[PDB]
Amino acid sequence: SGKLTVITGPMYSGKTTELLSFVEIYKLGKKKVAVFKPKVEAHVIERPEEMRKYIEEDTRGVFIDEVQFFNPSLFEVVKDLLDRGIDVFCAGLDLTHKQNPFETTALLLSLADTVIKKKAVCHRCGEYNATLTLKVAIDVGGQEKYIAVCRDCYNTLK
Amino acid sequence: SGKLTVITGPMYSGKTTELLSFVEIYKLGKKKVAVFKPKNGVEAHVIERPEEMRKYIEEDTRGVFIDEVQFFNPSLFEVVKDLLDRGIDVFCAGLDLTHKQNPFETTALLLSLADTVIKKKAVCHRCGEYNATLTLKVAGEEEIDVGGQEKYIAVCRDCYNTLK
Amino acid sequence: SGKLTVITGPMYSGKTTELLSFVEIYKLGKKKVAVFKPKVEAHVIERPEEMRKYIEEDTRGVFIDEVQFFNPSLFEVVKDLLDRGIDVFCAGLDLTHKQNPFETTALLLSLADTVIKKKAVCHRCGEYNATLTLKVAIDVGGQEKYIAVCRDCYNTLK
Amino acid sequence: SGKLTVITGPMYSGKTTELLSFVEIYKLGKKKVAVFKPKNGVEAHVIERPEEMRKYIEEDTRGVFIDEVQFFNPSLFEVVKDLLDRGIDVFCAGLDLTHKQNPFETTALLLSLADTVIKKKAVCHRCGEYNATLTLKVAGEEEIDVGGQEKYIAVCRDCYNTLK
Ligand SMILES: Cc1cn([C@H]2C[C@H](O)[C@@H](CO)O2)c(=O)[nH]c1=O
Ligand SMILES: Cc1cn([C@H]2C[C@H](O)[C@@H](CO)O2)c(=O)[nH]c1=O
Ligand SMILES: Cc1cn([C@H]2C[C@H](O)[C@@H](CO)O2)c(=O)[nH]c1=O
Ligand SMILES: Cc1cn([C@H]2C[C@H](O)[C@@H](CO)O2)c(=O)[nH]c1=O
Ligand SMILES: [Zn+2]
Ligand SMILES: [Zn+2]
Ligand SMILES: [Zn+2]
Ligand SMILES: [Zn+2]
């Protein structure tokens, strides 16, 4: 059966490039892959249900970025992929800027065979110990809106 | 601040032993610990609600250890956050999925909060490989239901779906 | 084929109890184990060559504590166990008190399928960040002779 | 002090990509990095001896990244220790074993120094499972010998011993 690896951590944690590390292993192994993102080729989809459109009978790897943005229906969708022998690799955020769990990421962490926690550089103190995202301006965006911080700095800042 | 470590995996994956390894590091390092379990031996306080923990944590407590977290109220998520913010490291061990492969919610919340996650494997009861990630029930389709070998077996995904 | 897991870190890192976590998985799985230590049952042996005396045709797990003290001949001995389908789990020290590599542990880390790095509590600063052992009085012994420290404290102390 | 992370595994296990993920974290965090490679693109300095590194590390360097460490002189062990003691985090990627399953000594020394070790898997060239841990040579029984797909293949232990 397939194995599920979940990569997670705050923003600016190298999660996408880490997921791409796995994509490269499969392509190098001459294995068929399917890559997804929410709204080589990454298929932009909106619902998890839509992945079965793009999965082939010889698809071996399925890679999903930004999993926080998907419906929790992804849990059961991933489970079925695993039961078919398809390896799944997911990246996304574990917590919101309010330190509430992203529900979909949480379900996947529970399902995972392996979990990789990535850290970022703390925006405030400059150490390689950042595990949280602080919001400074669901809301898409980047360094103009979110910074990565350690727990100590978060608490000093909010 | 404190870090949170979560140890998870199916039954029979040596999760309690793993947690006790960490208790030991703090016991050898001269630090006050609190060990808790829900309503596995070193003087664990038995507690019903997570907020009952505050009572047992003194000003010099440096580590808080919690077994079988799947049985705790999800309000554990906020209680753990508070300890972390106070500089208390927390180590948790629990089951990640039920026998029906549904997530345990308290466990899943703590997984999202964790700084480090240790996923543990068990021996597959049917095939005997070191690859079992799921717990199958074998003697009631109730999700919360105490027991040992007489009621639950650890399996890999393939043997799970074969036995289902 | 077998898989090799190596547990390592400084003294007072919970390495023995972690190795025993694995021993318990096999015994619970009703699997035959063989446990070793250098000079349930742990067989006290002096050389790696002596392990083949105690390994059965249905031995599935082989557990080796204090691997720093074994001859580097253990590398090839472990390799052959793996090729036979026997899972191997080893614990021991990565560095001496002078921060020189323990040669046998180093060879095993290179062979390992999984490496677990354990930390201890720093004797000087009290944080859970100790990765080194400082000597304060090959030389067997314990807390009367060695303490665990973080790199910063080691360097302050030596 | 600085921490050392070592990424290792056989060929085709995405080790360089893994290392670049860490380079990125420091690039997004506004910190000076130094990337090095022996005599894989972001402006890596090409160096013959490890001690040639000192030249390229300025007073505000917070991370030092080294690809293909198996090719460096073992005197890298002492050079890395010095950076760590100076508060510079170091990330290293290299092969753990030769094609004959002998350890690479520079890699093994750094493995013992590491605070964190990331073991990476490749796809097995023969069986196609996500479980390959070894590199087999397929086109000279020399241990140090440059090449790609034309000369080395990644395999699991079973397929290695089958092809041997
Ligand atoms: C941290 C966080 C990020 N995001 C978004 C911002 C980014 O576009 C994306 C993470 O790359 O997630 C939220 O919607 N909410 C949050 O709380
Ligand atoms: C797997 C599983 C275990 N349990 C119990 C069995 C044990 O008494 C305890 C696990 O240590 O969890 C449940 O209540 N439901 C389940 O689905
Ligand atoms: C750290 C260290 C430990 N040891 C011994 C002390 C203990 O008896 C054993 C580790 O438990 O190793 C050495 O011989 N040399 C060293 O440098
Ligand atoms: C596996 C292996 C690789 N190499 C080289 C091949 C590549 O040029 C480089 C790995 O990135 O290492 C050796 O020199 N010897 C070996 O045994
Ligand atoms: Zn900070
Ligand atoms: Zn099985
Ligand atoms: Zn210290
Ligand atoms: Zn193979």
C-alpha A44: how far from chain center: 15
Per-residue CA distances from B39 to B36, B45, D161 (Å): 10, 9, 52
Which residues 71-100 of A have a C-beta within 8 angstroms of B? 75, 79, 82-83, 94-95, 99
Per-domain boundaries in chain C: 1-118, 119-158
Contact predicate C121/B29, CB 8 Å? yes
Q: Tell me the H-state helices in B86-131.
A: 105-113
Beta strand D134-137 with D152-155: parallel, antiparallel or unpaired? antiparallel
The span from the first CA to the last CA of chain B, in angstroms, equals: 45
- CA torsion, points A147, A151, A153, A155, in degrees to nearest 10? 110
Per-residue CA distances from C5 to A13, C86, D85, D138 (Å): 27, 12, 29, 28
Contact predicate D12/D35, CB 8 Å? no
- Residue C59 is encoded by which pair of tokens? 């031995």
Contact predicate D63/D34, CB 8 Å? yes
Q: In angstroms, rounded to a whole number, what is the distance separating the alpha carbons of residues A151 and B114?
A: 12
Most B CBs within 10 Å, among C15, C24, C32, to test the B interface: C24
- Closest-CA residue in chain A for D4? A128
φ, ψ (nearest 5 deg) of residue D129 = -85, 160
C67 is in an annotated binding site: yes
Domains D1-120 and D121-164 share a fold: no
DSSP secondary structure string, B13-75?
S-HHHHHHHHHHHHHHTT-EEEEEEE---SSPEEESSGGGGGGG--TTEEEEEES-GGGS-TT
Within 8 A by CB and 6+ apart from D110, the residues are D4, D6, D69, D76, D77, D80, D92, D94
CB-based contact, C120 to chain B, within 8 Å: yes
Contact predicate A60/A84, CB 8 Å? no
Element spanning D124, H or E: none
Q: In angstroms, rounded to a whole number, what is the distance separating the alpha carbons of residues D74 and D99?
A: 19
Architecture of domain C1-118: 3-Layer(aba) Sandwich (3.40)
CB-based contact, D158 to chain A, within 8 Å: no
- Tell me which method was used to determine the 3D structure: X-ray
- CA torsion, points B59, A127, B26, B93, in degrees to nearest 10? 100
Q: In angstroms, rounded to a whole number, what is the distance separating the alpha carbons of residues A48 and A77?
A: 7
- CA torsion, points B130, B134, B137, B138, in degrees to nearest 10? -30
Using DSSP, state whether C98 is helix, strand or coil.
Answer: coil
Total Cβ atoms within 10 A of residue A74: 25
Chains touching chain A, criterion 3+ CB pairs below 8 Å: B, D
φ, ψ (nearest 5 deg) of residue D152 = -140, 145
To 10 degrees, what angle do helices D15-28 and A15-28 make?
160
Q: In angstroms, rounded to a whole number, what is the distance separating the alpha carbons of residues C106 and C83?
A: 20
**CATH of span B121-164:** 3.30.60.20
The finding on whether A118 has its CB within 6 A of some atom of ligand 1 is no
The greatest distance separating any two alpha carbons of chain B, rounded to the nearest whole angstrom, comes to: 52
Using DSSP, state whether A27 is helix, strand or coil.
Answer: helix
Q: In angstroms, rounded to a whole number, what is the distance separating the alpha carbons of residues B25 and C13?
A: 6
How many CB contacts within 8 angstroms connect chain A with chain B? 69
- CA torsion, points C127, C129, C133, C137, in degrees to nearest 10? -10
CB-based contact, C124 to chain D, within 8 Å: no
Contact predicate C17/B27, CB 8 Å? no
Chains touching chain D, criterion 3+ CB pairs below 8 Å: A, C
Q: Which of B41, B42, B48 is nearest to B71 (CA)?
A: B48
Q: In angstroms, rounded to a whole number, what is the distance separating the alpha carbons of residues A79 and B103?
A: 12
- Residue D83 is encoded by which pair of tokens? 């950076």
**CATH of span D1-120:** 3.40.50.300
The greatest distance separating any two alpha carbons of chain D, rounded to the nearest whole angstrom, comes to: 52
Query: Contact B108/A112, CB-based, under 8 Å?
Result: no
Element spanning D55, H or E: none
Beta strand C120-121 with C128-130: parallel, antiparallel or unpaired? antiparallel
φ, ψ (nearest 5 deg) of residue A23 = -60, -40
Amino acid at A130: A
Q: In angstroms, rounded to a whole number, what is the distance separating the alpha carbons of residues C23 and C3?
A: 14
Contact predicate D80/D65, CB 8 Å? no
Query: Contact C106/D101, CB-based, under 8 Å?
Result: no
Task: Please indicate whether residue B143 is annotated as part of the active site.
Answer: no
φ, ψ (nearest 5 deg) of residue A80 = -65, -35
Element spanning C152, H or E: helix C151-157
Beta strand B122-123 with C114-117: parallel, antiparallel or unpaired? unpaired
Residue that has been written with the tokens 């015994």 in this structure: C27
Per-residue CA distances from D48 to A101, C58, D52, D71 (Å): 48, 50, 7, 9
- Residue A140 is encoded by which pair of tokens? 């898409």
Contacts of B131 in chain C (CB under 8 A): none
Query: Contact A117/B114, CB-based, under 8 Å?
Result: yes
- Residue C58 is encoded by which pair of tokens? 């249905």
DSSP state of D71: G
Within 8 A by CB and 6+ apart from C115, the residues are C5, C6, C8, C109, D111, D117, D119
- CA torsion, points A109, A111, A116, A121, in degrees to nearest 10? -10
Options 3.40.50.2000, 3.40.50.360, 3.30.60.20, 3.40.470.10; CATH of C119-158: 3.30.60.20
Q: Which of C20, C115, C19, C36 is nearest to C71 (CA)?
A: C36
Element spanning D95, H or E: strand D89-95
Q: Tell me the H-state helices in C33-116.
A: 74-84, 103-111
Rounded CA Rg of chain D: 16
Contact predicate B21/B118, CB 8 Å? no
Percent of chain B as helix, strand, coil, to the nearest 5: 30, 30, 40
Q: Which of B72, B128, B134 is nearest to B99 (CA)?
A: B134
Q: In angstroms, rounded to a whole number, what is the distance separating the alpha carbons of residues D2 and D5?
A: 10
Contact predicate B85/B97, CB 8 Å? no
- CA torsion, points D9, D12, D14, D16, in degrees to nearest 10? 90
Within 8 A by CB and 6+ apart from D47, the residues are D36, D37, D38, D39, D53, D56
DSSP state of A89: E
Q: In angstroms, rounded to a whole number, what is the distance separating the alpha carbons of residues C53 and C59?
A: 12
Q: From its phi and psi, is residue D30 left (phi > 0), alpha (psi between -120 and 50) or beta? A: left
Top mutation candidate among C7, C11, C145 for ligand 3, by most atoms within 8 Å of CB: C11
Query: Contact A21/D17, CB-based, under 8 Å?
Result: yes
CB-based contact, A156 to chain B, within 8 Å: no
Total Cβ atoms within 10 A of residue D161: 13
Which candidate from B1, B115, B119 shows the least CB-CB separation from A112?
B119
Q: Which of C37, C27, C20, C26 is nearest to C3 (CA)?
A: C26
CB-based contact, B149 to chain A, within 8 Å: no
- Residue D10 is encoded by which pair of tokens? 């056989």
- Closest-CA residue in chain D for A3? D130
Q: Which of A12, A10, A33 is nearest to A21 (CA)?
A: A33
The finding on whether B131 has its CB within 6 A of some atom of ligand 2 is no
Within 8 A by CB and 6+ apart from C109, the residues are C6, C8, C94, C115, D96, D108, D111, D112, D117
Ligand 3 centroid – CA C63 distance (Å): 19
Total Cβ atoms within 10 A of residue B99: 22
Q: In angstroms, rounded to a whole number, what is the distance separating the alpha carbons of residues B24 and B146?
A: 28
φ, ψ (nearest 5 deg) of residue C65 = -90, 160
Contact predicate B70/B95, CB 8 Å? yes
Q: In angstroms, rounded to a whole number, what is the distance separating the alpha carbons of residues C32 and C62?
A: 9
Contacts of D4 in chain C (CB under 8 A): none
Length, in residues, of chain D: 164
Query: Contact C26/B122, CB-based, under 8 Å?
Result: no
Query: Contact B157/A112, CB-based, under 8 Å?
Result: no
Contact predicate B163/B134, CB 8 Å? no
Rounded CA Rg of chain C: 16
DSSP secondary structure string, C10-25?
STTSSHHHHHHHHHHH
Rounded CA Rg of chain B: 16
The finding on whether D146 has its CB within 6 A of some atom of ligand 4 is yes
Beta strand A132-135 with A146-149: parallel, antiparallel or unpaired? antiparallel
DSSP state of A49: G
Q: Tell me the H-state helices in chain D.
A: 15-28, 76-85, 105-113, 157-163
- Residue A47 is encoded by which pair of tokens? 């619902």
- Residue B8 is encoded by which pair of tokens? 């998870």
CB-based contact, C3 to chain B, within 8 Å: yes
φ, ψ (nearest 5 deg) of residue A31 = -115, 145
Within 8 A by CB and 6+ apart from A133, the residues are A10, A11, A93, A95, A96, A97, A146, A147, A148, A149
- Residue D45 is encoded by which pair of tokens? 């300095």
Per-residue CA distances from A15 to A120, B111, B135 (Å): 10, 17, 30
Ligand 8 centroid – CA C2 distance (Å): 13
Contact predicate B154/B125, CB 8 Å? yes
Within 8 A by CB and 6+ apart from C140, the residues are none
A4 strand-pairing partners: A88
To 10 degrees, what angle do helices C103-111 and D105-113 make?
100
- Closest-CA residue in chain D for C116? D117
- Residue A37 is encoded by which pair of tokens? 């993102």
Contacts of A26 in chain D (CB under 8 A): 123
Contact predicate A128/A121, CB 8 Å? yes
Contact predicate D126/D100, CB 8 Å? no
Residue B76 CB burial class (10 angstroms; 0-12, 13-18, ≥19): buried
Task: Give the HSE-up count for residue B60: Cα atoms under 13 Å, Cβ half-sphere.
Answer: 5
Sign of CA dihedral C12, C15, C18, C19: negative
